[PDB]
Amino acid sequence: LVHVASVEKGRSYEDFQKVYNAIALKLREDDEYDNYIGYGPVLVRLAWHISGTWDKHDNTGGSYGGTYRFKKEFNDPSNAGLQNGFKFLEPIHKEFPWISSGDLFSLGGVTAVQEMQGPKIPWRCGRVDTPEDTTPDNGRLPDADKDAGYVRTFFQRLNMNDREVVALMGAHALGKTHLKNSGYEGGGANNVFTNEFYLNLLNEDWKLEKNDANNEQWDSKSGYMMLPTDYSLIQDPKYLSIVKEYANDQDKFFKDFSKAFEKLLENGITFPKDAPSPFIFKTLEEQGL
């Protein structure tokens, strides 16, 4: 099973920078969503969930086919709340109907991270929409009620090692949980990409509490929360070392996150040797827009 990247006919960097700019301007303008967090975090989550279905064993799932547009995947209980991100992107797809679905969903994540003052994430085009029968079954995305061993084992399916896992989890500096989506009660939230997830894990006095959906989560008197899978990163000695590293080196975190997130978004895709190089998009701020 091979998925070969194929550049949307005649398109080049300038075309994709236009799409980036459209997403970025809408992020700036539709700022009220989710109590003024805006759409950045949900777009990051969307890009991760469309990629996180991948299975290295058989090359099924992943971002290539844009299969989230089909009912089976759209309605996965693990994807509750992502409809908001899909709705955000729909008008942009109408404006740029030539872009593939997987390219749009992945580019939305890239755009969001950069516009939230995160690292630059190189991005490659050429995902191709695949038919409804290529849609992975539900249940490939991870549960939040588990321990470090679960996290480690889960991420082996995505060909991610312990450093890649800890870097990726730093995206939990962004946004929040919502009881109605996931059964976890949200805490303090931000929409600026920093290494604060790691600082909070190490510095707060966490208490194991039960929420109104009868799930356990870790809460602090400061008003922050951690999922069990978040907290696992300080219970496991290998993960803890890496958490400390990123707490103490913002730049290292940014660089490691950039590499792991690009990898996540490209898993399963074969890029021909004459494919274009990855694009690095300018932010609105860099363009004076």
C-alpha–C-alpha distance, residues 38 and 190, integer Å: 10
Q: Active-site residue 93, yes or no?
A: no
Stretch that binds ligand HEM, among 168-176, 206-214, 244-252, 281-289 (CB under 6 A): 168-176
Shortest reach from residue 179's CB to ligand HEM, in Å? 7
Question: Is 41 among the residues that bind ligand HEM (CB under 6 A)?
Answer: yes
Structure tokens at 217: 């989560």
Shortest reach from residue 4's CB to ligand HEM, in Å? 25
Residues 6+ apart with CB under 8 A from 58: 1
The residue among 40, 198, 49, 190 whose CA lies nearest residue 113 is 40
- Are 42 and 176 in contact by the 8 Å Cβ rule? The answer is no
Question: Is 142 among the residues that bind ligand HEM (CB under 6 A)?
Answer: yes
In this chain, which of 27, 89, 174, 242 binds ligand HEM, going by CB under 6 A? 174
Out of 49, 57, 93, 178, which one is annotated catalytic?
49
3 among annotated binding-site residues: no
Q: State the pairing for strand pair 216-219/225-226.
A: antiparallel
CA distances to 34, 249, 251 from 195, in Å: 22, 8, 9
Shortest reach from residue 86's CB to ligand HEM, in Å? 13
Question: Is 269 among the residues that bind ligand HEM (CB under 6 A)?
Answer: no
Question: Is 184 among the residues that bind ligand HEM (CB under 6 A)?
Answer: yes
Beta bridge partner(s), residue 269: 3
Residue ranges of alpha helices (H) inside 30-75 are 33-36, 40-51, 71-74
C-alpha–C-alpha distance, residues 131 and 123, integer Å: 24
**Toward ligand HEM, which CB reaches closer, 121 or 269?**
121
Beta bridge partner(s), residue 232: none
**Toward ligand HEM, which CB reaches closer, 139 or 272?**
139
State the catalytic residues.
49
- Binding residues for heme b are 172
Please give the residue ranges that form the binding site for ligand HEM (CB under 6 A). Answer: 41-42, 44-45, 48, 81, 142, 144, 151, 168-169, 171-172, 174-178, 181-182, 184, 227, 229, 261
